[PDB]
Coordinates of N, CA and C and ligand atoms in Angstrom, one line a residue:
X23 N 36.4 159.8 136.0 CA 37.0 159.6 134.7 C 38.1 160.6 134.5
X24 N 39.2 160.2 133.8 CA 40.3 161.0 133.5 C 41.3 160.3 132.5
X25 N 42.4 161.0 132.2 CA 43.4 160.5 131.3 C 44.7 161.2 131.4
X26 N 45.7 160.6 130.8 CA 47.1 161.2 130.9 C 48.1 160.5 130.0
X27 N 49.3 161.0 130.0 CA 50.4 160.4 129.3 C 51.7 160.4 130.0
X28 N 52.7 159.8 129.5 CA 54.0 159.7 130.1 C 55.1 159.5 129.1
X29 N 56.4 159.5 129.6 CA 57.5 159.3 128.7 C 58.7 158.7 129.4
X30 N 59.8 158.6 128.7 CA 61.0 158.1 129.2 C 62.2 158.3 128.3
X31 N 63.4 158.0 128.8 CA 64.6 158.1 128.0 C 65.3 156.8 127.7
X32 N 65.7 156.6 126.5 CA 66.4 155.3 126.0 C 67.8 155.2 126.7
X33 N 68.4 154.1 126.3 CA 69.8 153.8 126.8 C 70.4 152.6 126.1
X34 N 71.6 152.8 125.6 CA 72.3 151.7 124.9 C 73.6 151.3 125.6
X35 N 73.9 150.0 125.8 CA 75.1 149.6 126.5 C 75.2 148.1 126.3
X36 N 76.3 147.7 125.7 CA 76.6 146.3 125.4 C 78.0 146.1 124.9
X37 N 78.4 144.8 124.7 CA 79.8 144.5 124.1 C 80.2 145.6 123.2
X38 N 81.3 146.3 123.5 CA 81.9 147.3 122.7 C 83.4 147.1 122.4
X39 N 83.8 147.5 121.3 CA 85.2 147.3 120.8 C 86.0 148.6 121.2
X40 N 86.8 148.5 122.3 CA 87.6 149.6 122.7 C 89.0 149.5 122.2
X41 N 89.7 150.6 122.0 CA 91.1 150.6 121.5 C 92.1 150.2 122.6
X42 N 93.0 149.4 122.3 CA 94.0 148.9 123.3 C 95.2 150.0 123.3
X43 N 94.9 151.2 122.9 CA 95.9 152.3 122.9 C 95.4 153.5 123.7
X44 N 94.1 153.9 123.4 CA 93.5 155.0 124.0 C 92.2 154.6 124.8
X45 N 91.8 153.4 124.6 CA 90.6 152.8 125.2 C 89.4 153.6 124.8
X46 N 89.3 153.8 123.4 CA 88.2 154.5 122.9 C 87.2 153.6 122.2
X47 N 85.9 153.7 122.5 CA 84.9 152.8 122.0 C 84.8 153.0 120.4
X48 N 84.9 151.9 119.7 CA 84.8 152.0 118.2 C 83.4 151.9 117.8
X49 N 83.2 151.9 116.4 CA 81.9 151.8 115.9 C 81.6 150.4 115.3
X50 N 82.7 149.6 115.2 CA 82.6 148.2 114.7 C 84.0 147.5 114.8
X51 N 83.9 146.2 114.5 CA 85.2 145.4 114.6 C 86.2 145.9 113.6
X52 N 85.7 146.6 112.5 CA 86.6 147.1 111.5 C 87.3 148.4 112.0
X53 N 86.5 149.3 112.6 CA 87.1 150.5 113.1 C 88.2 150.3 114.1
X54 N 88.1 149.1 114.7 CA 89.1 148.7 115.7 C 90.5 148.4 115.0
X55 N 90.4 147.5 114.0 CA 91.6 147.1 113.3 C 92.3 148.3 112.6
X56 N 91.5 149.2 112.1 CA 92.0 150.4 111.4 C 92.4 151.5 112.3
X57 N 91.5 151.8 113.3 CA 91.8 152.8 114.3 C 93.1 152.6 115.0
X58 N 93.6 151.3 114.9 CA 94.9 151.0 115.5 C 96.1 151.4 114.6
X59 N 95.8 151.5 113.3 CA 96.8 151.8 112.3 C 97.2 153.3 112.5
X60 N 96.2 154.1 112.6 CA 96.4 155.6 112.7 C 96.7 156.0 114.2
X61 N 96.1 155.2 115.1 CA 96.3 155.5 116.5 C 97.7 155.0 117.0
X62 N 98.5 154.5 116.0 CA 99.8 154.0 116.3 C 100.9 154.9 115.6
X63 N 100.5 155.6 114.6 CA 101.5 156.4 113.9 C 100.9 157.9 113.8
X64 N 99.9 158.1 114.6 CA 99.3 159.5 114.6 C 100.3 160.5 114.9
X65 N 101.0 160.3 116.1 CA 102.0 161.3 116.5 C 103.3 160.6 116.9
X66 N 104.4 160.7 116.1 CA 105.6 160.0 116.3 C 106.8 161.1 116.4
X67 N 107.3 161.2 117.7 CA 108.3 162.2 117.9 C 109.6 161.8 117.2
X68 N 110.1 162.6 116.3 CA 111.3 162.4 115.5 C 112.6 162.4 116.3
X69 N 112.4 162.6 117.7 CA 113.5 162.7 118.6 C 113.7 161.4 119.3
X70 N 112.7 161.0 120.1 CA 112.7 159.7 120.9 C 111.9 158.6 120.2
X71 N 111.3 159.0 119.1 CA 110.5 158.0 118.3 C 109.3 157.5 119.2
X72 N 108.6 158.4 119.8 CA 107.4 158.1 120.6 C 106.2 157.8 119.8
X73 N 105.1 157.5 120.5 CA 103.8 157.3 119.8 C 102.6 157.7 120.7
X74 N 102.0 158.8 120.3 CA 100.9 159.3 121.0 C 99.6 159.0 120.3
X75 N 98.4 159.3 120.9 CA 97.1 159.1 120.3 C 96.8 160.2 119.3
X76 N 97.1 161.5 119.7 CA 96.9 162.6 118.8 C 98.2 163.3 118.5
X77 N 98.1 164.1 117.4 CA 99.3 164.8 116.8 C 99.7 166.0 117.8
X78 N 98.7 166.5 118.5 CA 99.0 167.6 119.4 C 99.7 167.2 120.6
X79 N 99.4 166.0 121.2 CA 100.0 165.5 122.3 C 101.5 165.5 122.1
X80 N 102.0 165.1 120.9 CA 103.4 165.0 120.6 C 104.0 166.4 120.4
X81 N 103.3 167.3 119.7 CA 103.7 168.6 119.5 C 104.2 169.3 120.8
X82 N 103.4 169.0 121.9 CA 103.8 169.6 123.2 C 105.0 168.9 123.8
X83 N 105.0 167.6 123.7 CA 106.1 166.8 124.2 C 107.4 167.2 123.6
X84 N 107.4 167.3 122.2 CA 108.6 167.7 121.5 C 109.3 168.9 122.2
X85 N 108.5 169.7 122.8 CA 109.0 170.9 123.4 C 109.7 170.6 124.7
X86 N 109.1 169.6 125.5 CA 109.7 169.2 126.7 C 110.5 167.9 126.6
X87 N 110.7 167.5 125.3 CA 111.5 166.3 125.0 C 112.9 166.4 125.4
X88 N 113.5 165.3 125.8 CA 114.9 165.3 126.2 C 115.8 164.9 125.0
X89 N 115.3 164.0 124.1 CA 116.1 163.6 123.0 C 116.3 164.7 122.0
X90 N 115.4 165.7 122.0 CA 115.4 166.8 121.1 C 116.9 167.4 121.1
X91 N 117.3 167.8 122.2 CA 118.7 168.4 122.4 C 119.7 167.5 121.8
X92 N 119.5 166.2 121.9 CA 120.4 165.2 121.3 C 120.0 164.8 119.9
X93 N 119.4 165.8 119.2 CA 119.0 165.6 117.8 C 119.7 166.6 116.9
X94 N 120.7 166.2 116.1 CA 121.4 167.1 115.2 C 120.4 167.6 114.1
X95 N 119.7 168.7 114.4 CA 118.7 169.3 113.5 C 119.4 169.5 112.1
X96 N 120.6 169.9 112.1 CA 121.4 170.1 110.9 C 121.1 169.0 109.9
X97 N 121.5 167.8 110.3 CA 121.3 166.6 109.4 C 120.2 165.7 110.0
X98 N 119.3 166.2 110.8 CA 118.3 165.4 111.4 C 118.8 164.1 111.8
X99 N 119.9 164.0 112.6 CA 120.5 162.8 113.0 C 120.6 162.7 114.5
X100 N 119.7 161.9 115.1 CA 119.7 161.7 116.6 C 120.8 160.8 117.1
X101 N 121.2 161.0 118.4 CA 122.3 160.2 118.9 C 121.8 159.6 120.3
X102 N 122.8 158.9 121.0 CA 122.5 158.3 122.3 C 122.7 159.4 123.4
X103 N 123.8 160.1 123.3 CA 124.2 161.1 124.3 C 124.5 162.4 123.6
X104 N 124.9 163.4 124.4 CA 125.3 164.7 123.9 C 126.8 164.7 123.5
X105 N 127.6 164.1 124.4 CA 129.1 164.0 124.1 C 129.4 163.3 122.8
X106 N 128.6 162.3 122.5 CA 128.8 161.5 121.3 C 128.5 162.4 120.0
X107 N 127.3 163.0 120.0 CA 126.8 163.8 118.9 C 127.7 165.0 118.8
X108 N 128.1 165.6 119.9 CA 128.9 166.8 119.9 C 130.1 166.7 119.0
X109 N 130.7 165.5 119.0 CA 131.9 165.2 118.2 C 131.5 165.2 116.7
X110 N 130.2 164.7 116.5 CA 129.7 164.6 115.1 C 129.4 166.0 114.6
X111 N 129.1 166.9 115.5 CA 128.7 168.3 115.1 C 129.9 169.2 115.2
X112 N 131.0 168.7 115.9 CA 132.2 169.5 116.1 C 133.3 169.1 115.1
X113 N 133.2 167.8 114.7 CA 134.2 167.3 113.8 C 133.7 167.5 112.3
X114 N 132.4 167.4 112.2 CA 131.8 167.5 110.8 C 131.3 168.9 110.6
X115 N 130.2 169.3 111.4 CA 129.6 170.6 111.3 C 130.5 171.7 111.9
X116 N 131.3 171.2 112.9 CA 132.2 172.1 113.6 C 131.5 173.3 114.2
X117 N 130.4 173.0 115.0 CA 129.6 174.0 115.6 C 130.2 174.4 117.0
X118 N 130.7 173.4 117.7 CA 131.2 173.6 119.0 C 130.3 174.4 119.9
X119 N 129.0 174.0 119.8 CA 127.9 174.6 120.6 C 128.3 174.7 122.1
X120 N 127.4 175.2 122.9 CA 127.7 175.3 124.4 C 127.5 173.9 125.0
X121 N 128.7 173.3 125.3 CA 128.7 172.0 125.9 C 128.2 172.0 127.3
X122 N 127.5 171.0 127.8 CA 127.0 170.9 129.2 C 128.1 170.8 130.2
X123 N 127.7 170.8 131.5 CA 128.6 170.7 132.6 C 129.3 169.3 132.6
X124 N 130.6 169.3 132.6 CA 131.4 168.0 132.6 C 131.2 167.3 134.0
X125 N 131.3 166.0 134.0 CA 131.2 165.3 135.2 C 131.9 163.9 135.2
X126 N 132.2 163.4 136.3 CA 132.9 162.1 136.4 C 132.0 160.9 136.0
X127 N 130.8 161.2 135.7 CA 129.8 160.2 135.3 C 130.5 159.2 134.4
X128 N 129.9 158.0 134.3 CA 130.4 156.9 133.5 C 130.1 157.1 132.0
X129 N 131.0 156.7 131.1 CA 130.7 156.9 129.7 C 130.7 155.5 129.0
Ligands
ZN30 ZN1 93.3 154.4 120.0
ZN31 ZN1 110.5 163.0 121.9
ZN32 ZN1 124.8 166.5 111.9

């Protein structure tokens, strides 16, 4: 004669609503439609107009961003190239900042 006991661990896994932006499992069909609203405008670089999942991800990018330099902080006005904006900052703001190396490149 004798006796004893035992145990075990649960587990959940089934149809889940993941985000088509960061692939994050939601809590419901509603969290998906909404999570997409914030996960779309969470982090938008005012330079290249990007869209990240978190606000930090952008903060870092802005530092290594290329459009940044092409962004007239003065009047927060971005441009297509440096030569183009330069004229806007040299003719209007008249800054005449340090222009880049000239080249035969196409314009
Ligand atoms: Zn997302
Ligand atoms: Zn950017
Ligand atoms: Zn300007």
